[PDB]
Amino acid sequence: LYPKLNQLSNSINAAVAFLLEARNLEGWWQDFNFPQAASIGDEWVTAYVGTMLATLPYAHVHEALMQAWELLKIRDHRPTGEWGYNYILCGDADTTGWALQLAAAVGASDSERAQQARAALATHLQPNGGIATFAEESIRAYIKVPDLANVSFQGWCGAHTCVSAAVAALPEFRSRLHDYLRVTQTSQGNWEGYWWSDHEYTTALTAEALAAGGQAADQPSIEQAVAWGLKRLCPQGFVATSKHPNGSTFATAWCLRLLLLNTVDAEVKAARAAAIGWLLEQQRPNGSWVSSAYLRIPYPFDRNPNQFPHWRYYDEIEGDKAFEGSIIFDHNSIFTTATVVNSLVKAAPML
Numbered sequence: 001l002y003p004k005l006n007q008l009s010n011s012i013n014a015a016v017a018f019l020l021e022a023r024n025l026e027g028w029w030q031d032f033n034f035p036q037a038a039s040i041g042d043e044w045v046t047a048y049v050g051t052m053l054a055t056l057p058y059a060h061v062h063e064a065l066m067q068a069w070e071l072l073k074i075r076d077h078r079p080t081g082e083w084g085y086n087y088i089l090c091g092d093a094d095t096t097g098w099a100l101q102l103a104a105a106v107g108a109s110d111s112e113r114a115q116q117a118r119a120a121l122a123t124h125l126q127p128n129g130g131i132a133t134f135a136e137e138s139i140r141a142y143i144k145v146p147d148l149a150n151v152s153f154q155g156w157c158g159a160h161t162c163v164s165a166a167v168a169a170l171p172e173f174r175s176r177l178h179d180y181l182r183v184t185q186t187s188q189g190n191w192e193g194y195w196w197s198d199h200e201y202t203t204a205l206t207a208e209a210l211a212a213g214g215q216a217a218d219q220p221s222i223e224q225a226v227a228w229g230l231k232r233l234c235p236q237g238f239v240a241t242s243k244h245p246n247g248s249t250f251a252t253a254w255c256l257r258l259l260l261l262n263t264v265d266a267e268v269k270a271a272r273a274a275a276i277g278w279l280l281e282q283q284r285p286n287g288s289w290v291s292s293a294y295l296r297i298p299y300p301f302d303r304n305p306n307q308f309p310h311w312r313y314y315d316e317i318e319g320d321k322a323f324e325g326s327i328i329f330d331h332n333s334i335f336t337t338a339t340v341v342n343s344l345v346k347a348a349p350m351l
């Protein structure tokens with residue numbers, strides 16, 4: 001089926017063109033907004049989008065990633081050597097983790113800044129063997145809200161499965177985070193993230209990290225995650241959520257990445273074909289995909305955001321509004337598009 005492969009090419013090329021044109025003056029990828037507060041993310045989004053595009057074999061994409069890495073090196077204002085949501089935010093383990101994946105793609109894992117950043121990641125390792133997003137002193141020093149002045153930050157500064165999964169993509173950390181990632185798997189075979197509504201994100205990344213480890217003992221856990229991924233994907237080739245009952249592009253893209261970890265099962269191959277089919281049909285004329293990268297802001301004290309039923313979408317809230325207990329999305333559609341195009345490139349050869 002050469003027409004379906006040619007459409008994947010045309011779809012991927014349209015998405016890459018959108019992403020390259022979507023960069024700002026300096027050349028940053030920007031997405032998400034905390035209006036009249038944390039403002040727009042760059043360091044994080046650029047680190048993620050750069051890592052997503054690393055799978056492309058194009059020379060002009062690699063040039064964009066080398067510029068992305070140069071822009072990150074210039075962000076050297078934090079004494080830890082970490083990267084944050086944007087300039088004004090303190091360093092976090094997730095951003096730093098994604099920046100180190102981009103570093104590896106541009107052959108800069110051995111660089112001074114990469115070594116300093118990897119060293120800083122080690123401080124975020126918790127007793128239970130997981131990675132915490134924030135150090136309490138850093139995030140408290142930034143936050144200047146009266147309501148959250150002397151509240152607990154053990155939610156934001158506790159070990160997170162979503163961040164631990166992403167950081168475990170780094171070979172230096174995969175072995176240390178292994179045991180934490182194994183015990184945090186649910187009976188249904190999936191994982192649950194802290195900052196993300198869609199479990200497919202954390203499930204795909206954890207399974208990929210375990211797969212990269214190459215340990216036979218982890219294969220049953222991977223196969224149980226794939227089986228869960230197959231249940232989540234409906235016959236029409238999309239992941240249905242409460243928000244998007246006719247399919248989330250973000251969740252489906254990550255589910256498609258999860259299903260690449262089984263390459264023998266005929267039913268899994270058929271599901272991937274269905275997922276590619278739907279994603280191709282959903283792509284907008286400008287090459288982007290409709291924003292569905294839902295980032296939630298738990299209360300600083302909340303360790304269990306998956307047990308928080310009061311989630312509201314920040315932009316739909318009538319009246320004066322706080323970010324705590326609210327969900328924000330990628331308004332530029334750069335985070336979503338980067339996720340989808342990455343999944344389509346990795347999935348194309350397994351048709």
Ligand SMILES: CC(C)=CCC/C(C)=C/CC/C(C)=C/CC/C(C)=C/Cc1cc(C(=O)O)cc(O)c1O
Nearest residue numbers: 037038044085092094095133143144145195323324
């Ligand atoms: C971990 C990840 C998925 C990506 C790595 C990048 C991260 C850290 C993504 C998470 C989302 C968060 C919380 C990012 C920091 C920004 C912030 C502390 C937002 C809340 C807030 C701010 C302010 C304020 O700016 O003053 C006032 C608030 O009331 C308020 O809730």
